[PDB]
A paper describes a structure:
Whereas previous structural analysis by X-ray crystallography only resolved the N-terminal IgV-like domain of CEACAM1 (residues 35–142), our cryo-EM structure, after shifting the center of reconstruction toward one CEACAM1, also resolves the following IgC2-like A1 domain (residues 35–234 in total). Although the ECD of CEACAM1 is highly glycosylated and our data revealed several glycosylation sites on the IgV-like and IgC2-like A1 domains, no glycans are involved in the interaction with CbpF. For CEACAM1, the residues with highest SASA differences (F63, Q78, G85, T86, T90, L129) are arranged around a cavity at the tip of the IgV domain where the interaction with CbpF occurs. While the IgC-like domains are heavily glycosylated, the IgV-like domain that is involved in interaction with CbpF is less glycosylated.
Residue numbers in the entry: 35 to 234
The structure:
Amino acid sequence: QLTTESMPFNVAEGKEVLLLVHNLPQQLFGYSWYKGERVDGNRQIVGYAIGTQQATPGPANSGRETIYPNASLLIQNVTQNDTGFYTLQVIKSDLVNEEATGQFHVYPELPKPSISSNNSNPVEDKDAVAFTCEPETQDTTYLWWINNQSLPVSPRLQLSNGNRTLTLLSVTRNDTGPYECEIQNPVSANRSDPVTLNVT
Ligand SMILES: *[C@@H]1O[C@H](CO)[C@@H](O)[C@H](O)[C@H]1NC(C)=O
Ligand SMILES: *[C@@H]1O[C@H](CO)[C@@H](O)[C@H](O)[C@H]1NC(C)=O
Ligand SMILES: *[C@@H]1O[C@H](CO)[C@@H](O)[C@H](O)[C@H]1NC(C)=O
Ligand SMILES: *[C@@H]1O[C@H](CO)[C@@H](O)[C@H](O)[C@H]1NC(C)=O
Ligand SMILES: *[C@@H]1O[C@H](CO)[C@@H](O)[C@H](O)[C@H]1NC(C)=O
Ligand SMILES: *[C@@H]1O[C@H](CO)[C@@H](O)[C@H](O)[C@H]1NC(C)=O
Ligand SMILES: *[C@@H]1O[C@H](CO)[C@@H](O)[C@H](O)[C@H]1NC(C)=O
């Protein structure tokens, strides 16, 4: 049961991903890595022939891919477009083909976000000011930080636009504190400048 493992599963842009191979048969004739779930000649990335110990790039090669004698495929200077499935073809000594599949995801290196307010001078007795992390990004998870702690879940803490927008239904002067926003993707995360609440 040939299997493939992508180490790491998630990779930031510009780094490299190494695909490992397990349960490799004892008798082998050659390997081949193809872009996509289907073994097709046009999608061949690289091939290796144990008999002649020759490694030859395929039509889909871009110079960033190298094949090791242990069937491991190394891709350097990865990019977002590389996110997809990869299939390994193993040719046994008897030339009967055995296939396997693997995948990995590429994610951007997010920047520190920013916060904007729809009201800059909250009314002390009550107000419905709204906060939002403006630099919207895909497949990102938003976290709101208040007073150096996670937001206390309460109905007064409304959320919108998924939860990229945080609205305090009823503000109070006791709510004064540092307001900070974080974005985290499967690979990286850091926070924004803490905004303050104005009252007197
Ligand atoms: C395969 O060979 C490369 C280069 O020596 C190495 O980095 C990698 O860990 C090896 N993988 C396995 C499963 O042996
Ligand atoms: C990585 O890819 C980018 C875009 O082609 C290029 O500008 C950069 O020089 C490459 N870096 C390396 C070490 O190959
Ligand atoms: C930290 O923020 C800076 C600038 O916004 C950005 O270059 C970097 O990708 C971020 N690093 C992490 C681990 O989130
Ligand atoms: C703007 O701030 C005021 C403060 O009371 C609030 O009533 C209103 O709902 C907010 N509108 C938006 C789009 O955030
Ligand atoms: C408080 O702020 C610091 C950064 O200034 C941060 O490292 C720390 O995790 C925060 N503490 C809590 C409980 O969130
Ligand atoms: C924000 O939206 C995401 C959607 O997956 C959810 O997982 C998360 O629990 C939400 N956070 C809050 C405080 O509602
Ligand atoms: C505000 O915080 C102070 C802390 O001593 C507390 O005594 C007071 O009851 C709070 N007022 C309201 C309206 O929550």
